[PDB]
Amino acid sequence: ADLEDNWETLNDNLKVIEKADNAAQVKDALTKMRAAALDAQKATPPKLEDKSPDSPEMKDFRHGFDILVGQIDDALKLANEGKVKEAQAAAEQLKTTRNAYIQKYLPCFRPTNITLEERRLIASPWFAASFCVVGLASNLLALSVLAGATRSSFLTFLCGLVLTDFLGLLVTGTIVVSQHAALFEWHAVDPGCRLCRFMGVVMIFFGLSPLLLGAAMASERYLGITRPFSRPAVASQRRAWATVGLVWAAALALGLLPLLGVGRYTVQYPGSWCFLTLGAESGDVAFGLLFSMLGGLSVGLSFLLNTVSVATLCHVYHGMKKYTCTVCGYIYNPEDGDPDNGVNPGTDFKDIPDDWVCPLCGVGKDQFEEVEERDSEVEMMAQALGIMVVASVCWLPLLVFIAQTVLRNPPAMSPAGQLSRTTEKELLIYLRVATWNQILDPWVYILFRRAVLRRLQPRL
Ligand SMILES: O=C(O)CCn1c2c(c3ccccc31)C[C@H](NS(=O)(=O)c1ccc(F)cc1)CC2
Numbered sequence: 001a002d003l004e005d006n007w008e009t010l011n012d013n014l015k016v017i018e019k020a021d022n023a024a025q026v027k028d029a030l031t032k033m034r035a036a037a038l039d040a041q042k043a044t045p046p047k048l049e050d051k052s053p054d055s056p057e058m059k060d061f062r063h064g065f066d067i068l069v070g071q072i073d074d075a076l077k078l079a080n081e082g083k084v085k086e087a088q089a090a091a092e093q094l095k096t097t098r099n100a101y102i103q104k105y106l107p108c109f110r111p112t113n114i115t116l117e118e119r120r121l122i123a124s125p126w127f128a129a130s131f132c133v134v135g136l137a138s139n140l141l142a143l144s145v146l147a148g149a150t151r152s153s154f155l156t157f158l159c160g161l162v163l164t165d166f167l168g169l170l171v172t173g174t175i176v177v178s179q180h181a182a183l184f185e186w187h188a189v190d191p192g193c194r195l196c197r198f199m200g201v202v203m204i205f206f207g208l209s210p211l212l213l214g215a216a217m218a219s220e221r222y223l224g225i226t227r228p229f230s231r232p233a234v235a236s237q238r239r240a241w242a243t244v245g246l247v248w249a250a251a252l253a254l255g256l257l258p259l260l261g262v263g264r265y266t267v268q269y270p271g272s273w274c275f276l277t278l279g280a281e282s283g284d285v286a287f288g289l290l291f292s293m294l295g296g297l298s299v300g301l302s303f304l305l306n307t308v309s310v311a312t313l314c315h316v317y318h319g320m321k322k323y324t325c326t327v328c329g330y331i332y333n334p335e336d337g338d339p340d341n342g343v344n345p346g347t348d349f350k351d352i353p354d355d356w357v358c359p360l361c362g363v364g365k366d367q368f369e370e371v372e373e374r375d376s377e378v379e380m381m382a383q384a385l386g387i388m389v390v391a392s393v394c395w396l397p398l399l400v401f402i403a404q405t406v407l408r409n410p411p412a413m414s415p416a417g418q419l420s421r422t423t424e425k426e427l428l429i430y431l432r433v434a435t436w437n438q439i440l441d442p443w444v445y446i447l448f449r450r451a452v453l454r455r456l457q458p459r460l
């Protein structure tokens with residue numbers, strides 16, 4: 001069987017000896033442990049794949065189980081000699097040796113060339129905690145100033161983004177801080193592989209969600225500015241919240257792919273976080289590219305839609321009084337007229353006769369609305385730009401790096417799962433750069449407001 005299964009069998013039976021009241025029930029738990037230890041001895045741990053069956057690393061691996069079986073047999077002798085508390089004492093020693101001989105070989109853990117000294121130097125739980133507190137305080141501030149500001153689709157997406165950033169920092173931040181406080185010894189926080197896999201799912205979820213929500217904001221702006229105006233309705237707010245839920249569900253489904261067998265979550269340098277494995281295996285390539293293509297496309301789509309929206313706002317919030325066809329969105333521009341249909345440039349919409357129709361869809365003047373300049377639309381366009389700039393600067397270096405690592409001609413990662421120290425050190429840098437998106441998205445909303453500008457112009 002798999003190492004993880006034998007590991008579970010071992011722990012399940014350790015709690016059994018712990019609760020146990022007689023020698024016979026301690027004996028059965030100890031017998032199951034011996035079979036699980038002998039079973040685990042035959043296993044090939046992924047971090048020893050390139051190593052030959054008779055290599056030093058494999059000899060030390062198989063030897064660990066001789067030590068475990070020897071400790072099981074020492075507790076079995078104690079149980080067969082009727083001594084209950086003596087066999088429970090010798091069995092509790094296996095909780096320490098299971099960490100030495102099983103824990104480090106679990107699928108979470110790839111091989112690393114990090115020393116105990118390098119770990120003591122990087123470990124900074126107070127720096128990390130302070131930095132999370134700043135991020136959470138920023139997101140609580142945005143939510144607070146959003147509460148005092150009604151049924152808009154843009155603010156719905158923005159509220160989704162702030163709640164995602166806040167929660168992201170809280171969940172992943174507390175795992176990061178715990179790992180720094182434990183000097184990156186995962187067994188101290190959670191023995192086994194469960195916390196690591198939870199960390200990975202939640203890293204993808206809170207990595208993809210702000211990016212997808214940023215693209216949702218660019219889409220709302222584009223449809224809102226290009227198509228005729230519609231007063232923020234309860235239905236539009238409802239539709240925007242349903243969309244935030246679909247985005248969250250899509251980001252969650254994506255994070256669950258390694259649990260379904262597409263990709264894999266492993267502990268990453270310095271040992272404070274888990275993420276997709278930057279390997280050359282089919283699943284590592286597919287999941288790594290799926291994550292980077294999804295994030296890349298979100299930022300790219302945001303760029304395309306925002307440039308069209310800014311250009312539309314500029315052209316529309318200047319010049320003569322414009323009118324839009326509330327059927328196709330055609331904008332009657334007095335500067336141009338409609339000369340092929342008798343309207344020379346300069347003709348104000350009011351001077352166009354009753355029997356003129358839209359040159360795009362052919363409906364009458366009755367279907368035309370005045371294009372009204374709203375400061376709120378400018379405020380929202382500025383905020384959508386701020387969010388797009390923040391995701392470009394913070395998320396793109398990481399997204400490009402993931403895709404580049406996963407696609408490297410000679411593989412970036414060894415068969416055992418080892419990356420070079422420079423690859424690990426860069427991944428940490430880009431991951432740290434990406435964290436700032438969760439800290440800065442609330443500030444774009446806090447700072448890019450008319451009230452902030454009105455209280456800055458005289459104070460500058
Ligand atoms: O140990 C490290 O330095 C990397 C961990 N890193 C990280 C955080 C942090 C907070 C303070 C100091 C270092 C930190 C907190 C940070 N959470 S997050 O911004 O919500 C986020 C970022 C990237 C991501 F893919 C998914 C979620 C995860 C990475």
Ligand SMILES: CC(C)CCC[C@@H](C)[C@H]1CC[C@H]2[C@@H]3CC=C4C[C@@H](O)CC[C@]4(C)[C@H]3CC[C@]12C
Pocket residue numbers: 234237238239241242244245246248249252
């Ligand atoms: C658990 C995760 C994956 C998804 C949960 C989010 C979805 C299903 C839920 C939770 C909160 C909900 C929204 C809360 C706020 C509003 C505003 C109101 O005017 C109409 C309902 C509406 C629009 C709700 C629609 C659906 C909603 C977005």
Ligand SMILES: [Zn+2]
Pocket residue numbers: 325326327328329330358359360361362363
């Ligand atoms: Zn028309």
